[PDB]
Every structure is written in structure tokens, then in C-alpha cells.
Amino acid sequence: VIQLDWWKNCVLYQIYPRSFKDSDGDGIGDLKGIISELKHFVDAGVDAIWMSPIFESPMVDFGYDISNFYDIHYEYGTMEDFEELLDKAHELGLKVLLDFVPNHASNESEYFIKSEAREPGYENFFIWADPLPNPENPGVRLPPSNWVSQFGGSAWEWSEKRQQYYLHQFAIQQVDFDFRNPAVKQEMFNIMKFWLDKGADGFRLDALPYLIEADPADHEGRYPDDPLSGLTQFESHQLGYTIPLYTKDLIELYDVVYEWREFLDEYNKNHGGDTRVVFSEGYANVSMTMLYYGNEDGAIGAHFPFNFDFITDLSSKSNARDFVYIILRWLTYMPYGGIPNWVFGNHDNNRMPTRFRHDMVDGLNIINMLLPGVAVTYQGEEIGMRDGYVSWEDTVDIEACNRGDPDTYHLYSRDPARTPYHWDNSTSAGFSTSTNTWLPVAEDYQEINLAKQKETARSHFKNYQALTKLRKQATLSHGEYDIRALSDRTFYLVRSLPTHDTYVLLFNVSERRDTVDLGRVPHLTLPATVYVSSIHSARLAGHEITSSQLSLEAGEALVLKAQPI
Amino acid sequence: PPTEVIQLDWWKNCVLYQIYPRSFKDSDGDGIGDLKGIISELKHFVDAGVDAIWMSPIFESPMVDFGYDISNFYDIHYEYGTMEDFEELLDKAHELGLKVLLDFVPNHASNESEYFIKSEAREPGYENFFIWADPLPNPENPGVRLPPSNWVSQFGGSAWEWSEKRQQYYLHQFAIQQVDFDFRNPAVKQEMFNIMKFWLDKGADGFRLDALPYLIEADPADHEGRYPDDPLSGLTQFESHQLGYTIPLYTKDLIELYDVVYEWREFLDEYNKNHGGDTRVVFSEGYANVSMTMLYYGNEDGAIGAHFPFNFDFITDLSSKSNARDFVYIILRWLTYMPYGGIPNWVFGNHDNNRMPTRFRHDMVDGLNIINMLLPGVAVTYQGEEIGMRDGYVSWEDTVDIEACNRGDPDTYHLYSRDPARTPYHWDNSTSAGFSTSTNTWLPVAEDYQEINLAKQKETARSHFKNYQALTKLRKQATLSHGEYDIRALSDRTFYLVRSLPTHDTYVLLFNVSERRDTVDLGRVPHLTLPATVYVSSIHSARLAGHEITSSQLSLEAGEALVLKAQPI
Ligand SMILES: OC[C@H]1O[C@H](O)[C@H](O)[C@@H](O)[C@@H]1O
Ligand SMILES: OC[C@H]1O[C@H](O)[C@H](O)[C@@H](O)[C@@H]1O
Ligand SMILES: [Ca+2]
Numbered sequence A: 001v002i003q004l005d006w007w008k009n010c011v012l013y014q015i016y017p018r019s020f021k022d023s024d025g026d027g028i029g030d031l032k033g034i035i036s037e038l039k040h041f042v043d044a045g046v047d048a049i050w051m052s053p054i055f056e057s058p059m060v061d062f063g064y065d066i067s068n069f070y071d072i073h074y075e076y077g078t079m080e081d082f083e084e085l086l087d088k089a090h091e092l093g094l095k096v097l098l099d100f101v102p103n104h105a106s107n108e109s110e111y112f113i114k115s116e117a118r119e120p121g122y123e124n125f126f127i128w129a130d131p132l133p134n135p136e137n138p139g140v141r142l143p144p145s146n147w148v149s150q151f152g153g154s155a156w157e158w159s160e161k162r163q164q165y166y167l168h169q170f171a172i173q174q175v176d177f178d179f180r181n182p183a184v185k186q187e188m189f190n191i192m193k194f195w196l197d198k199g200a201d202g203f204r205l206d207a208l209p210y211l212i213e214a215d216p217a218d219h220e221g222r223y224p225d226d227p228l229s230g231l232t233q234f235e236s237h238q239l240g241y242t243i244p245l246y247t248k249d250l251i252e253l254y255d256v257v258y259e260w261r262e263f264l265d266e267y268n269k270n271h272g273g274d275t276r277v278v279f280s281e282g283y284a285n286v287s288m289t290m291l292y293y294g295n296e297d298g299a300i301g302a303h304f305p306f307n308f309d310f311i312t313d314l315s316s317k318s319n320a321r322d323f324v325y326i327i328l329r330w331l332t333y334m335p336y337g338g339i340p341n342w343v344f345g346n347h348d349n350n351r352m353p354t355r356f357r358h359d360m361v362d363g364l365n366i367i368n369m370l371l372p373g374v375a376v377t378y379q380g381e382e383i384g385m386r387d388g389y390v391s392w393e394d395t396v397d398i399e400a401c402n403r404g405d406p407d408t409y410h411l412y413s414r415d416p417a418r419t420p421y422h423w424d425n426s427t428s429a430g431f432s433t434s435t436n437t438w439l440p441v442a443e444d445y446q447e448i449n450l451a452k453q454k455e456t457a458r459s460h461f462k463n464y465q466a467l468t469k470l471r472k473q474a475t476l477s478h479g480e481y482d483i484r485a486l487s488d489r490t491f492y493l494v495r496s497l498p499t500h501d502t503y504v505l506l507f508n509v510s511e512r513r514d515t516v517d518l519g520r521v522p523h524l525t526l527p528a529t530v531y532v533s534s535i536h537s538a539r540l541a542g543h544e545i546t547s548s549q550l551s552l553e554a555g556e557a558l559v560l561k562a563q564p565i
Numbered sequence B: 001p002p003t004e005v006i007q008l009d010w011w012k013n014c015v016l017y018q019i020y021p022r023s024f025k026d027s028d029g030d031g032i033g034d035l036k037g038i039i040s041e042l043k044h045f046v047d048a049g050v051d052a053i054w055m056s057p058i059f060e061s062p063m064v065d066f067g068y069d070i071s072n073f074y075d076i077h078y079e080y081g082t083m084e085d086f087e088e089l090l091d092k093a094h095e096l097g098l099k100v101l102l103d104f105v106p107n108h109a110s111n112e113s114e115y116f117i118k119s120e121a122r123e124p125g126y127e128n129f130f131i132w133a134d135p136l137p138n139p140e141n142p143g144v145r146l147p148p149s150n151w152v153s154q155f156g157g158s159a160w161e162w163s164e165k166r167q168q169y170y171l172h173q174f175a176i177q178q179v180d181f182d183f184r185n186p187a188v189k190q191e192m193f194n195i196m197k198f199w200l201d202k203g204a205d206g207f208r209l210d211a212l213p214y215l216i217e218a219d220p221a222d223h224e225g226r227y228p229d230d231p232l233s234g235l236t237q238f239e240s241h242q243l244g245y246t247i248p249l250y251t252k253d254l255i256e257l258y259d260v261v262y263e264w265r266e267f268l269d270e271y272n273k274n275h276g277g278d279t280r281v282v283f284s285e286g287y288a289n290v291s292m293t294m295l296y297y298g299n300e301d302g303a304i305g306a307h308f309p310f311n312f313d314f315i316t317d318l319s320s321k322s323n324a325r326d327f328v329y330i331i332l333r334w335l336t337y338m339p340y341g342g343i344p345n346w347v348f349g350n351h352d353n354n355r356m357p358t359r360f361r362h363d364m365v366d367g368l369n370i371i372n373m374l375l376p377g378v379a380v381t382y383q384g385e386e387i388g389m390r391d392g393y394v395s396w397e398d399t400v401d402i403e404a405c406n407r408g409d410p411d412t413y414h415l416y417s418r419d420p421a422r423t424p425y426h427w428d429n430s431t432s433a434g435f436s437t438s439t440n441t442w443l444p445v446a447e448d449y450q451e452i453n454l455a456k457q458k459e460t461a462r463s464h465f466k467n468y469q470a471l472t473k474l475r476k477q478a479t480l481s482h483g484e485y486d487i488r489a490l491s492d493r494t495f496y497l498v499r500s501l502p503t504h505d506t507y508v509l510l511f512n513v514s515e516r517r518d519t520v521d522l523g524r525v526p527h528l529t530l531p532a533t534v535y536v537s538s539i540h541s542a543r544l545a546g547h548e549i550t551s552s553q554l555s556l557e558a559g560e561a562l563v564l565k566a567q568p569i
């Protein structure tokens, strides 16, 4: 079995730096805090970390509004702290990826200040458009089109200084670059070269579906209105009012991604050492998601686009057949030679055990680790962290502040998945020496924390460790997969490889006991040994499964070790 | 040597052909297809390698919905013929070794049925045979009559019709003339057993039952003594009289409907036990989400339902918009959701949907028939798919579909009309394509009948029909009846389907569903060892049957499909 390049079967962990570890008692996570817990990634069996943005930012969208793409946000630390983090992560054998959003810059960026001021070379750096006349009151200017921001209201903001509207698909303070401007595309290569020269192992790149919008040149000099959804529940200022035909998934965006990959291939060729990678973010239908890998004209894109299917298409409402059918979607659509990946959460979505159930944490981590390719873990999933309670008063997410009110903010807020990491049962769950955490610590940190799980016989974290260890086995790096539902309640996933041990997941995803015939599972010879069990299972690691009839309790997952095929 | 295999029960791997009798063969020049026409062409099913036929309804009917408005469930519609013609059809079909299934709709009866006439007259035994409801109290305008709820008919307008005679509304999920039975009435349920026993006793091999998602609606007992409003869609393009205004929460897919289906299977199992000979079957129709579709098979409490629900995925979820990955992913949906022991089936068309080559492309006909025949289980063919018939042009003036007449106008009728898929069958290039001796047919014959007709395809070297015969012949091979199946996309353009069975020949479909050429590595296809032989090819393929595939690199044209025969595993 030929050793794979590191990025083909890494365990990749997303750090949300503001909530990982506070080293200096300001209630804000920082780079010295990360550096102090780099050993956690080695202990967990993580190969690679990526951080939510740490570049200079006014923090309107907590780092996704970037005012300087070449330096470190002061609350997180200095360039020297970042250099230390790379150095110490590399000494521990970890890979470190930087995340930034190519789509937009902070309105406090020099790019925007100069563009707004029509400074030479900067006039066309962002999307600038004239108003339309208003038939119903001519004093009230109308925006260039009906386009709606992802955070609600118009995607167009008036600039007093420039006397034009600028485009913002996200917050007012996040200004969309013009990706038809060769100088914008050059600046992206400049930013990437700068951080690759510092020794970064690659990039994650956000909000790619929104890169390119309709060219007014193709619409008689107008920005064309997006079609209406025609749904009475959305007013003109509300996300859902429009279908983003002219504002999302434009085929031209992929050409920008293919150019990024061409640049990275040339960089890897010229510098050698370990491959530097680019992973892309886009929430889009599966066929538009697969174009990030490349196209059938032979274009090559991101090393992979993130697979959000366990966020978008599965929940506690899903049965075992739903689990199998959604897992099959990436495996069916992915190009030949493509690397699969599995994402169970992030700082934009409810935490894994909240979207599913508290009794499904171990089964979900097993799916992540046992499916072919790359396991992606969001901060907290290795200990089963739940959504934290955040009051209206304590809400800081711009999405909730702009779309929501004291009665509705919980429908929109991303803050419950951004509460500080549960290190232990000390003040602020050991995230900080201060009680003044930027978001409130979840109420359950005394029951759910890393230190407790390390000192109990059976725990989500000990299961996580056993599963990342299991990924060293040839059966998981190189083995076939077989996946099928045994019932509406239980499915199996088998990894097999001739002459190497067989590994079988059995998972009752339902709220009721289920009894299955193990004779239905391909490649499973009995007796077999329990390798991992859910923390609530009656079966311990080392338990022998001898009967073909197996009763699984609600949420119960087993990994069995069986005879080689 | 090749292993002995046990022959499957007939219904587990039959080629099932839907006849639309009004459009199949006119024996008497009235431009209307009839039973003597079908009898005259029973040899067509043997020639095609069809095992079983089902007929769109041939029971007495005022023809408001061309047979689906049934006025007598125990006799034959006069335009199609007589009970004697039906007994002759069964006898001759059985002599030729064909199975015959009758289709009828349990959901509703004609307003000209004795059931409805007796019910409207509140006759003993019939007063509660249908859903009858008082107006919704209008305390505000006591002089304005309100229907019981906002429920919308599938053919447009209110699902409630006022009866001056009864001074109540009756429910019709379909046309005004199609009256919904009360399926909580034990006498309605017994009458459905009585209908099935009557036709099984005549010698029918089974039933297809229509419109099952609509059987049961909300009980007013659960809604404080009124019929509850269906929730609103909130779509600005629909007003209260337009299908789409509501979401059918209280009118479709109610869990109690499946108990009726499980009772039908119980009745049939008891009938089979008490009559012996070959199994008589029930196939169910419902257009529903996959979880609600699989409940027709049975439930995980051990209830058993239809021998299978029809799989409409090649109608509802695939089209000319689909790539090879879409094809594979949709095929995997039935295989992933079907219960253990469930027999898979595959439907590419019917009289309610556009014809297969119109929904896909003209260059995809052979590949679509190959998928149908090589997938495990039952292949279902709709009249004309064996010759690649396209939708016929039907003007507003020639439109007779009640759905288009009620929902449509000269500008919009084409959005709704089912008539294009109901045009007369193309036998040959004679008057009215040999469907009729007369130039006057009940729907116009498609303009392409001189290019697309059965006699032409029997006489040309290569044709859709000759490919169809080769594929139904191939289904008798153990590899297709008993073999395993492996399906994956090689690219966005091309997928494989492999049927394999140790000691028996391997068969491989390769299909480029795209509008572009594709080159694939046959080294990636499981169980394929080269050299292999072309068994069937698309009529436009570079490769004739017998062509030797020696290279691992294979270039396929847009729409090109091959079946390869390869050495046993
Ligand atoms: O930058 C706009 C958005 O980009 C990405 O999706 C981020 O994950 C999200 O947090 C941010 O709001
Ligand atoms: O009876 C109502 C409906 O039932 C079935 O779906 C028929 O196939 C359709 O043609 C008819 O209109
Ligand atoms: Ca943009």
C-alpha cells in the first residue's frame, strides 16, 4: 500500500481562535493560547489545523471582515506569535492552513478607502454602480438592482464620498472585490505568496459561490434583478425574496479557482518540500460543488471543496436510509481520483450533538473517521460540545443583529456554536482566567469538558483518540467501502482490504432499540471484537460479538474488528 | 460449468408493458382503440419478449377522464368492447403464456355509478359511501355558502362540489365527476374486495391500483368537527381555485391509507392460498417522497403491502438535464430505500407524462431501454417506448384531456395536457400509422409516424425494436435474473452497470448520457475482462453487435450505449 500525500487522509481540525484558548485574561482567544495547546492536536491524533481568520479586522463579522490581509489581528497577537505558532506546530509534525475570504474586504481596508476616493489603480477594485430613479418618490434613490445581502437588506450600500453604491453580498462593512479586475486577481496571488513564504501549509478560502455577479456589459449597462422566489413569507429586504441567478454560482468563478490552483502547483514545483494545498468553501448544489475539484475539460481546482452534507442534509430527523443515501452523494458525484472529506460542523452552524442528538456523538465521530478520505473536526466535536445558551443581550453575531429581534434572533444567530472551548471544570471551563469571556461559556461545561473525558474510562475524547489511531491502518487508508441500511433505524459501513483486518461500523441512528441480522453485513465473520462503542453501549472495547442477532439501543454505535477478507 | 439457478416467481422479473387501449389498435375504424384490436396484436407482446401486460382502465366509464371515471367496476366500456371480448383476450393471452393485469382507481367512482346515485339519494348502505360534508358555518354572511375547507382538486377548482339534491358537498380530489369514496367505511373496503374477487375469478393475474396517496383525508373528529384547511403554499402565482395554492397535508399521504393497502395484500394472499396456480399480484401507484413510497411495500412492524409500488424516478427526477452522476444517484435511491426482500421496478413513462425520448433526447432511446432491461427486478415499458415514439403535437382544438380543459386555455394548455403521450401507436406507414383504417382518430397521429413505426424497425438492419427484442431475450440469461449489480459513474458523461454471476457470462452497460463525446478507461469497470463482445449497441453506434472490444480505452458518442458480453467471474 503506497504512502499517500499528507492531505489525502489527514484528520483536519478547525480552530475558532477567538474561542479556543485565552492566554492573557481578556476573555478573547489568542495565538499564544493556541501555541500553549498545540500538544492537544498530537494527543487527539489531528494531522492538520486550519484557523478562522486571524488577519487585521474591525471584528464586525469576527475576522471575516479583513482590513489588512498581510498582518495579524492585535487581539489574537503579533506576526511574531504567528511565526512561533507555525514553528512549534511544524516541530510537532502538524500542518497549518490559513483561512481568508477572497470575496470581500473590510470597508476599513486601504483597498476600500482608496477605491472609494477613486485613487488611481483602485477605482475598479470593488463593484460600484449608479442609482435608479424612484417612480413613487423621486427624492429616494433606488439601488442598482433588487439583490439581497446574506445578512438581510439590500446588497447595495450608498457611499456619500463616491456618490455611487458598492456591492456587499455579506455585511455593509464587507465590500465585494471585482474579480473581473486583473489587479484584484494579482492581489490575491500577492496575499497567497506572502503567507506561503512565511511557511503556511496552504489555505482554506471562503464564500467562493459569491465571487462573480452578472456583468452589466451583458445586460445593456444594468445590474439585472435576481428573479423573485414568489413566496409571500419574504419581504423585499429578507433573504429568500430572490433566487440568486445573477449573484451566485456563476461559471466564471471556477476559472479564478483554477488559476489559484495553477499558481499553487507552480509554487509547490519551485519550492519543493511537502505539498501546499487549497481547500474551498461553497454551499451549493452537488454538481456546482464538484466544479471546485476541476471540470471535464481537464481544469484542476481546489485539492477539495468542503463536503457540508452532514450539516445541510442530515439531522435528528434523518433515518438510517437517509444517512446512507446522503453519504453516497459525495461518493457518487466526486471525480475519479478525488479526495472525499466529511464536515460535521463549523462556527456558522449548530453544533453536531444539537443538530443530531446527545446519544449520537460517538456514532457521528466514527462515520467521520471510518469513511474514506479526510475527516474534518470542528473545535468541540472531539468532546461532544453542545450549543451554548446566548441571550439576546449577549448576542454579537451581525447575522442575528441584522435579521433578528429578541423573539427571533435564535433562528439566525451563529453564536451558540462559538462559545468558549471546554478545557476543564475551572473558571470559564479553563478557556480563560477571566469570567469576562467574549461569549458566555455554555451552562454544561462541568459535565462536558476535555479534562473530565481524559480521566474517565470511557469518553467521547477517548473514542476520538481510538478512531484517529485506527486511521493509521491500511484498511482505512486504502480499503474498499460498503455501506447499506439494515433497517430504517440501523446502517453498516465496512472497510475491507484483502489480508488486512476488516472494520465494521454499526449505528442505530433512531430513538428506539433495533435488532439486526449481522449475516446481512458483507465481509463480517463472527466472532468479531468491539474496537470502539458509544459511551452508553453495554459493550466494552474487547467485548466479543458471537451471535448473528444484535440488539442496538437508541444512538448505539459499534466499530467491530473482524477477520481479513 | 455454469451453475443451475432456481427460476424466479413470474412477477419478480417480468417485462411489464402498459397498454393504453384507446390508442393501441382500432379494429373497427371508429378511430378508438379497442379489445379486438389488442387481441389481434397479442403476438406483438411475444415478439417483443413482454411477459405481462397491464391495461389502462377498460371498465364502463363516461370517459370524462378516459376510463379513470368508472361507472361500473364489473363490466367493459362499450367503445372497447364486451365482457366476451375481455374473456377472449384473457384466454388468448394465457394461451400465448402472457400474464394480464387490470388497472382501476380505488380512490373514486363516476357520478354516473350506481354507488353515487344511491349515495346522493341517501339510500340504505350508500349514504356514507362517499365523503359528504355540510357547508362551513358563515356566521358573518349567513346567506353566503362556504365549502367545508379550502381543498383544491388535482384538475383545478375546489375539491368540494355542492349537491342540490343532498344539500351537502361531496369531495372530488380529481374531476367534479370523480367522487372520492369514504375509505373509513367498512362497506367501501368490502366493495373493493368484491371487485378484485370478481376479476380474479374471471382469471386476471393481478391489479394495478391508481391514485393511492389520495385515499384518506383528515377526519373532522380530529379537527373540532370541521374538515381542516390545507396549509397555504404562499406562492404569489396561484389563487384559491388553482392547484399549487395549498400543500396537501390533510389530503395526501395520510398514514391510514397504508392500512387499506396492507388489507388488500392480506385479501390477495388469502385468495392465492385458496386458488393456487401462479401468484396473483397487486402493484400500487403513488407519486410521493421516497419514505412515503416505500410504505407501500410494508412497514417495519411487519405489515406487507403491494408486491411493489411503481418507481417513477426516471419520470420525476431525471431528464435531458441529467448527467451520468444524476443517473447513478437516482438509480441508487430505490436501491437504498427499498426494504429487505423488496422487488425493484423501473418506469420510464406512462399516459400521464411526456414520452421517454421527449423527456430525454431522441439519441438516448436505446440506452434508456438498456437501463430498464439490465437493472435488477422488473422492467416496465409504456406503449411506444419499444419503438422510441415521441410526444405527438396536439392543438388546443384537438385537446380532450380534462386536466388541460379545466386548468388551461389556448396559451397555457400545453403545460397540463397529457394528450401528447396518448397519440395512436405507430404500427406502420399506412393511414393513421396502421392504428386505424380511418384518417379520423380520437387524438391526432404524431407527424413523425413515417420515420418512427414498428414495421419499419422490423425491416431495417438496426432499430429501437430489434434492440428491445435483444434486451428482453437477454433477461432470460441467469446473469440478469439472478446476478449481482454494480453501478458507478466513470465521468460526468458516462456510467456503467455490471451484472455478474460466478460461472455465468458478465454483461456491462456503458452509457454516455451527455451531449458530448467521452473517453473512459474500461480497466475501472468491475468484472470486465477484455476482449469483450458488443451484444447490443445504440442505432447510431460505430459498433455493431459482434464487434470485439480489445482496447481498455473506449470513446463513446453523445447518447451512445453498449451492452458488452464478457467472460464469467
Ligand atoms: O465572510 C462571510 C462568511 O464567510 C464564511 O462563510 C464564514 O465562515 C462566515 O462566518 C462569514 O460570515
Ligand atoms: O383517476 C385519476 C388519475 O389516476 C391515475 O393517476 C391515472 O393514471 C390518471 O390518468 C388519472 O387522471
Ligand atoms: Ca463577489
Ligand SMILES: [Ca+2]
Pocket (backbone or CB within 6 Å): B107, B173, B180, B181, B214, B215, B216, B217
Ligand atoms: Ca380519497
Ligand SMILES: [Mg+2]
Pocket (backbone or CB within 6 Å): A021, A022, A023, A024, A025, A026, A027, A028, A029, A030, A075
Ligand atoms: Mg486573550
Ligand SMILES: [Mg+2]
Pocket (backbone or CB within 6 Å): A251
Ligand atoms: Mg469556460
Ligand SMILES: [Mg+2]
Pocket (backbone or CB within 6 Å): B025, B026, B027, B028, B029, B030, B031, B032, B033, B034, B079
Ligand atoms: Mg375501435
Ligand SMILES: [Mg+2]
Pocket (backbone or CB within 6 Å): none
Ligand atoms: Mg393574494
Ligand SMILES: [Mg+2]
Pocket (backbone or CB within 6 Å): B352, B416
Ligand atoms: Mg401532470
